[PDB]
Amino acid sequence: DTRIGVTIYKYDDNFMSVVRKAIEQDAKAAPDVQLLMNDSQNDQSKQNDQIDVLLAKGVKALAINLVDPAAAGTVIEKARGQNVPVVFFNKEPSRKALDSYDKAYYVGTDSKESGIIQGDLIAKHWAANQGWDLNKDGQIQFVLLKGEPGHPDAEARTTYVIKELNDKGIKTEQLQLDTAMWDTAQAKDKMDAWLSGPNANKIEVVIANNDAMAMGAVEALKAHNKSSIPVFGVDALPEALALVKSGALAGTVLNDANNQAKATFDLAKNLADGKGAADGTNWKIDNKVVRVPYVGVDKDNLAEF
Numbered sequence: 018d019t020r021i022g023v024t025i026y027k028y029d030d031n032f033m034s035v036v037r038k039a040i041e042q043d044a045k046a047a048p049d050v051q052l053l054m055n056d057s058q059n060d061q062s063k064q065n066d067q068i069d070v071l072l073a074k075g076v077k078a079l080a081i082n083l084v085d086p087a088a089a090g091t092v093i094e095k096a097r098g099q100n101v102p103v104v105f106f107n108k109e110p111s112r113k114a115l116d117s118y119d120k121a122y123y124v125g126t127d128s129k130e131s132g133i134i135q136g137d138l139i140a141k142h143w144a145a146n147q148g149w150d151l152n153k154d155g156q157i158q159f160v161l162l163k164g165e166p167g168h169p170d171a172e173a174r175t176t177y178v179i180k181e182l183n184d185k186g187i188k189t190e191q192l193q194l195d196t197a198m199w200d201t202a203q204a205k206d207k208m209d210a211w212l213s214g215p216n217a218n219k220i221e222v223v224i225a226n227n228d229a230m231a232m233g234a235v236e237a238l239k240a241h242n243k244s245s246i247p248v249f250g251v252d253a254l255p256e257a258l259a260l261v262k263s264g265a266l267a268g269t270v271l272n273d274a275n276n277q278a279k280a281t282f283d284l285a286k287n288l289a290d291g292k293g294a295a296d297g298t299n300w301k302i303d304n305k306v307v308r309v310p311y312v313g314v315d316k317d318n319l320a321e322f
């Protein structure tokens with residue numbers, strides 16, 4: 018069987034756990050492929066040792082989710098010894114590293130696109146629901162529940178949901194913006210304070226950097242009999258999709274783990290077989306990179322889940 022070595026930066030990450038399982042499913046579906054999977058336990062030195070072991074097993078391709086993006090050159094130089102192709106995924110190597118090897122590729126998507134897709138989702142529903150503009154001023158008065166300060170996904174989602182709305186021509190007015198540390202209970206307590214204060218009846222849209230905080234806000238809204246106010250999240254978690262179905266959550270955003278897995282597997286298998294990376298597929302490889310769009314989820318495409 019053709020062996021493909023895979024390193025996941027750490028198995029105790031929810032998103033990469035979904036990607037990992039999906040890649041394992043995709044390989045199971047390819048009878049002539051054997052996946053050699055590894056948990057790097059958030060230690061690049063351990064990942065490097067794991068790659069030395071994989072190369073001693075004759076893998077024909079490596080799919081590597083780096084712990085440290087700056088280690089891409091080290092990994093490429095190890096793979097080059099046996100001319101083994103490397104498909105990096107989810108953590109992006111530098112452009113210099115990708116350009117240094119003809120058989121290096123990347124599959125992943127900048128986190129700011131999750132804020133841009135959320136902003137487009139809110140614009141889509143705002144334009145379709147005039148009644149949400151409680152003061153009829155054409156602007157969205159919102160509150161935002163931020164992830165942990167300084168976390169790259171909290172910073173990007175907070176900055177870009179608002180830049181995207183404003184770039185689509187929708188002015189916004191930030192009535193409140195605080196962190197709830199990605200947590201449902203903290204978000205319920207923060208939203209409850211806002212609903213007990215001066216802005217309670219002026220808030221038109223609640224924006225959260227993830228679904229857990231969106232769900233805490235939905236609970237506070239129900240407690241205050243203010244469920245008329247729409248809430249948007251990010252993650253498309255199953256418990257959040259159940260609230261999209263019930264009408265309690267207006268929308269959320271999928272980070273498409275299945276397609277990151279599929280693109281990584283399809284490119285790695287083609288390269289292991291000595292074929293063009295995208296042969297037989299419709300992936301777009303632009304300067305060695307496949308981008309996998311985040312996707313807005315609401316009642317239009319909820320049946321897909």
Ligand SMILES: [Ca+2]
Pocket residue numbers: 150151152153154155156157158221
């Ligand atoms: Ca308004």
Ligand code: NA
Pocket residue numbers: 030031032
């Ligand atoms: Na996560």
Ligand code: NA
Pocket residue numbers: 125126127128272
């Ligand atoms: Na991403």
Ligand code: NA
Pocket residue numbers: 238243244245246247248264265266267
């Ligand atoms: Na609501």
